[PDB]
Amino acid sequence: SLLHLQEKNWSALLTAVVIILTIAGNILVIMAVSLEKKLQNATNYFLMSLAIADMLLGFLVMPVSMLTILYGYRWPLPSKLCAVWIYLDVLFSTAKIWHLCAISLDRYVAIQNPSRTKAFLKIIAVWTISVGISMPIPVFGLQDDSKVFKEGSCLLADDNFVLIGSFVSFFIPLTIMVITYFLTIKSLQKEAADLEDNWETLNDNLKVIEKADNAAQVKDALTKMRAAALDAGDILVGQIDDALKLANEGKVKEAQAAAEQLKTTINAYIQKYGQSISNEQKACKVLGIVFFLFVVMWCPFFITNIMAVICKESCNEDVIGALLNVFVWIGYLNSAVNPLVYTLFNKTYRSAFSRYIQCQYKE
Numbered sequence: 001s002l003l004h005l006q007e008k009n010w011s012a013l014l015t016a017v018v019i020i021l022t023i024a025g026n027i028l029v030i031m032a033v034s035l036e037k038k039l040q041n042a043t044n045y046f047l048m049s050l051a052i053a054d055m056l057l058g059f060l061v062m063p064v065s066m067l068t069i070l071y072g073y074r075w076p077l078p079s080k081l082c083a084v085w086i087y088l089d090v091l092f093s094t095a096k097i098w099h100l101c102a103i104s105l106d107r108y109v110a111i112q113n114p115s116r117t118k119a120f121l122k123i124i125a126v127w128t129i130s131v132g133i134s135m136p137i138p139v140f141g142l143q144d145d146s147k148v149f150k151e152g153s154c155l156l157a158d159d160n161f162v163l164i165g166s167f168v169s170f171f172i173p174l175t176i177m178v179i180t181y182f183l184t185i186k187s188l189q190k191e192a193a194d195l196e197d198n199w200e201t202l203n204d205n206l207k208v209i210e211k212a213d214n215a216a217q218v219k220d221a222l223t224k225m226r227a228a229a230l231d232a233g234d235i236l237v238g239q240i241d242d243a244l245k246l247a248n249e250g251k252v253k254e255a256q257a258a259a260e261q262l263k264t265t266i267n268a269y270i271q272k273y274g275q276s277i278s279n280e281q282k283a284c285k286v287l288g289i290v291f292f293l294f295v296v297m298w299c300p301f302f303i304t305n306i307m308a309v310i311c312k313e314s315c316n317e318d319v320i321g322a323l324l325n326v327f328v329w330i331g332y333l334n335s336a337v338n339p340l341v342y343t344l345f346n347k348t349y350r351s352a353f354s355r356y357i358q359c360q361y362k363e
């Protein structure tokens with residue numbers, strides 16, 4: 001006679017904290033994006049879908065996790081719900097990883113570029129891929145309980161599902177997330193670097209023009225400025241082309257005062273396009289924490305679920321089984337942390353959460 005409610009209640013209280021931090025956290029992220037105009041951007045659109053994935057984890061997967069801790073890991077529900085529960089748990093965690101891959105990729109491509117719908121295609125695509133990858137679990141598990149039960153404990157026993165699922169559903173977008181992140185940071189380092197190349201060579205020619213005697217030195221300098229005006233792309237190129245014909249007739253003192261009028265347009269277009277990459281670099285790092293903390297907090301669960309399969313004979317399967325029941329809750333907590341990052345590291349989400357708690361919904 002199994003399925004017995006126990007005194008495993010030290011652990012079972014802590015689990016209710018992680019459930020309510022997940023559900024309320026991620027509801028605020030869904031509420032913020034829907035109601036805040038400042039958040040209506042593609043990355044924020046993914047970060048909602050992630051928070052929907054986290055909330056569905058909190059409503060459906062995480063309570064049943066807690067339920068089995070209350071029954072000493074003997075599965076207390078109907079046996080055909082085990083594979084269902086294993087499916088949603090892997091669904092949501094596969095939808096989170098392929099999202100983080102989709103953000104890191106999309107932005108790199110956006111950093112090599114000059115819609116709600118273009119964003120909402122891409123989310124559905126990732127969910128479609130995630131549902132498709134996670135599909136063997138019910139298809140084969142509901143047919144054979146050997147894959148989803150180990151001694152009345154509902155867990156994914158199938159060692160091939162655990163291996164090939166780990167390297168298809170996880171390592172293929174982890175690789176692509178860390179590469180597209182690293183190049184995105186190298187893209188935005190080069191572009192800050194090119195901007196101060198073109199700060200110094202416009203500032204260099206404004207020294208050259210206001211020293212010049214002849215139409216030669218003004219013309220060469222202005223020609224070089226227009227070259228390194230084209231190197232930053234509109235607004236100011238025609239204004240140099242204004243002042244380029246003044247040098248060409250020989251109207252020198254007249255062209256030198258025109259170039260002083262270019263000087264306000266420059267410092268306008270520099271500090272505005274240089275607060276631009278200052279911002280993307282801030283955000284790319286906040287995504288990088290969301291990325292990093294996903295990986296780190298699941299890493300203990302993820303290595304140990306593979307040592308369960310590598311050292312099947314060599315290692316104590318009781319303590320391995322004993323560790324995973326901890327190491328899954330470290331990765332579950334991750335569902336609560338995405339919203340705290342956005343509180344700490346974005347003013348926009350923070351002011352939004354701040355109003356929603358005071359029940360005040362007009363921006």
Ligand SMILES: CC(C)CCC[C@@H](C)[C@H]1CC[C@H]2[C@@H]3CC=C4C[C@@H](O)CC[C@]4(C)[C@H]3CC[C@]12C
Nearest residue numbers: 030031033034035048052053055056059060088
């Ligand atoms: C397996 C079952 C329980 C899945 C349930 C999915 C639920 C939680 C999903 C599916 C469709 C989703 C909605 C689809 C689109 C939008 C519009 C968007 O601007 C705000 C979120 C909102 C309103 C979503 C809220 C969450 C939602 C209702």
Ligand SMILES: CCCCCCCC/C=C\CCCCCCCC(=O)OC[C@H](O)CO
Nearest residue numbers: 052078079080081084087091127131138142
């Ligand atoms: C944006 C969110 C998208 C979310 C997408 C979710 C997709 C769920 C579909 C597949 C599960 C297939 C399961 C098939 C039904 C099994 C039911 C079952 O086994 O029932 C047991 C019974 O209750 C014992 O008594």
Ligand SMILES: CN(C)CCc1c[nH]c2cccc(O)c12
Nearest residue numbers: 089090093154155156324325328
């Ligand atoms: C993310 N997913 C692969 C977790 C599977 C799981 C749910 N509940 C468990 C209990 C014990 C050992 C497990 O692998 C599990």
Ligand SMILES: [Mg+2]
Nearest residue numbers: 200201203204
């Ligand atoms: Mg210089």
